Amino acid sequence: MSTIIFGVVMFTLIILALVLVILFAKSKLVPTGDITISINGDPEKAIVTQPGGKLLTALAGAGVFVSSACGGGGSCGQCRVKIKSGGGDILPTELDHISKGEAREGERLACQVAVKADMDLELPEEIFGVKKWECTVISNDNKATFIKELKLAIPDGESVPFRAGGYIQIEAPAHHVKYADFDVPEKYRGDWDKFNLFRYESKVDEPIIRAYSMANYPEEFGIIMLNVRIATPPPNNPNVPPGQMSSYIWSLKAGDKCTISGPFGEFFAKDTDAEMVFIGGGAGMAPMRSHIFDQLKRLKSKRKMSYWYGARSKREMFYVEDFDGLAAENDNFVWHCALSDPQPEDNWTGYTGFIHNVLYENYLKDHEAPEDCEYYMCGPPMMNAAVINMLKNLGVEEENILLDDFGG
């Protein structure tokens, strides 16, 4: 045999000649040098990257956990990064999420940026800034049928620096929780026995994080109080896994240890002289109670307040002992509540039906400064959808309405 060995050696020589040319091109012409980037102009720290490395991957390796949940593909768009120097080649994927409002400065997407030269960044201080507090649980009493008011104390008596309307993030390690151990008083046992939620059980195998708005205005120091609703499966599909983190919070009892991670926030209150109208529903009590106490106890504002809450019954209502006192102390604040369907045991004498119907008939129908007032909305989505629809029907721009949907 002669052909076989000849073909083999010629094959090897051919592929070796090809690969040597490719290696020469990729090693003798490209920079082969490390790249240095600056996170901000003022600090002297510089992050070392690679020419073939992605910006998001380099930041993750350096420890700058910028906003990202997918790593690419345009699924989230959280990887947007501010820059003051960079290449002018904007990828179509970047342009999909970057409009002409952001194209003036040309900010890019982290998962779509390759650092081929010494560029600079202009990331916000928070991009690389956060905190944490091992909070001991004082109490987890039941104020509503499906809402637990968790109370947390920051160690060393250090009040977290936050603004009315912020939200902490709570970490939950892997655990299994039965619903048999939940403490619910005899006042709320009516619905749970009928629907039989005790037979469910949770299953979490990986750590998770969620967001929860504070229920305390900042002048209440050293207390982290929330209003957490149970993420029970809907009455249509009982076989679906239940709420992971909500089962964990309800499972938290008095005296236990919990960890919180930094004050956050985007749902704030504007600093004007215009009327404020708060509309609430369900477990949206935690954010609103913060601002009303804030503008009345911290800022002592003189502007016109009004807070409107909807409820399923008189057993779903709480915090009004503070609210009734607040209305009694201050003339600016006047509050009203309405039940969807009352029970004969409550002897309700007041507004009934949906809150959007109630606020329209009593106040907005005869109001003479329509739109001129600001609104704060937080609660179940259908309440949110109805209220924005009618406010648009009464002719209010989107700037005045400022809502906060709890994750859709």
Binding site: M1, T3, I4, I5, G7, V8, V9, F11, T12, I15, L16, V19
Partner: protein, 251 residues
């Protein structure tokens, strides 16, 4: 280290891939050549009319009956050479082994012609009964090839099969239609003046004609291609002297 490891793994993969691919390629060359020979043999046997089915039967029948040769076009006489493994296509493609035709004589529009030609004699015993001349010429959309089975006399056609053409099916690709191929039996190639007498008659030729044949309906361009093919390869520039020698004798 890294570079040495990459070089070593690349070289090892190259070696193993080369040995497997080389063994695979070397093993089957004989089978591939046998398949090509079988295809050509089946076409020639079907042209001649000897029924055959299966590779072994085709091989034995071809080796017993047919006997390839070589012919020199200029003088129309046999020559010596490997008639079994001749390749007229590459011989004509070679600049050294093929002349260049002029625009006046290239009726078939082939613009080249191999210096050495191949035939296929049919022998039943010592004598010769049929001679098969491979011919080709340009149609309308692509090259066309055929065998014409001339009787031992030198004028009577005993068969024709178009084994490679690319005309439009149904309209121009009617050359393979048996009802049209069978039309060529009994027809004659040369007239009493030994001139090319085959003529494709547009609109149909009278039955039992001396040298006529029905043209392809709605395909006069392919009919003209066939007419040019025969009118060229039956002239002096083609198999003319060889057919004259066949008429004289010695076959």
């Amino acid at each position: 280290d890294s570079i040495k490891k990459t070089l070593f793994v690349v070289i090892a993969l190259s070696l193993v891939c080369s040995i497997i691919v080389s063994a695979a390629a070397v093993g089957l060359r004989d089978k591939q050549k046998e398949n090509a020979a079988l295809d050509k043999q089946s076409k020639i046997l079907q042209v001649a009319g000897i029924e055959a089915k299966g590779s072994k039967q085709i091989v034995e029948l071809f080796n017993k009956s047919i006997e390839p040769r070589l012919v020199d076009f200029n003088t129309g006489d046999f020559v010596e050479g490997d008639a079994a493994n001749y390749d007229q296509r590459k011989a004509a493609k070679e600049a050294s082994e093929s002349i260049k035709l002029t625009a006046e004589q290239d009726k078939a529009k082939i613009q080249r012609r191999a210096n050495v030609g191949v035939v296929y004699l049919v022998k039943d015993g010592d004598k010769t009964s049929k001679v098969i001349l491979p011919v080709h010429g340009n149609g309308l959309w692509s090259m066309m090839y055929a065998f014409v089975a001339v009787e031992t006399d030198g004028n009577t056609v005993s068969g024709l099969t178009y084994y490679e053409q690319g005309e439009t099916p149904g309209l121009g690709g009617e050359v393979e239609n048996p009802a049209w191929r069978a039309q060529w039996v009994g027809k004659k190639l040369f007239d009493e003046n030994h001139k090319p007498a085959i003529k494709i008659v547009k609109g149909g030729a009278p039955q039992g004609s001396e040298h006529g044949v029905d043209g392809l309906s709605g395909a006069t361009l392919t009919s003209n291609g066939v007419q040019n093919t025969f009118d060229f390869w039956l002239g002096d520039m083609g198999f003319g002297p060889f057919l004259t020698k066949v008429r004289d004798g010695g076959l």
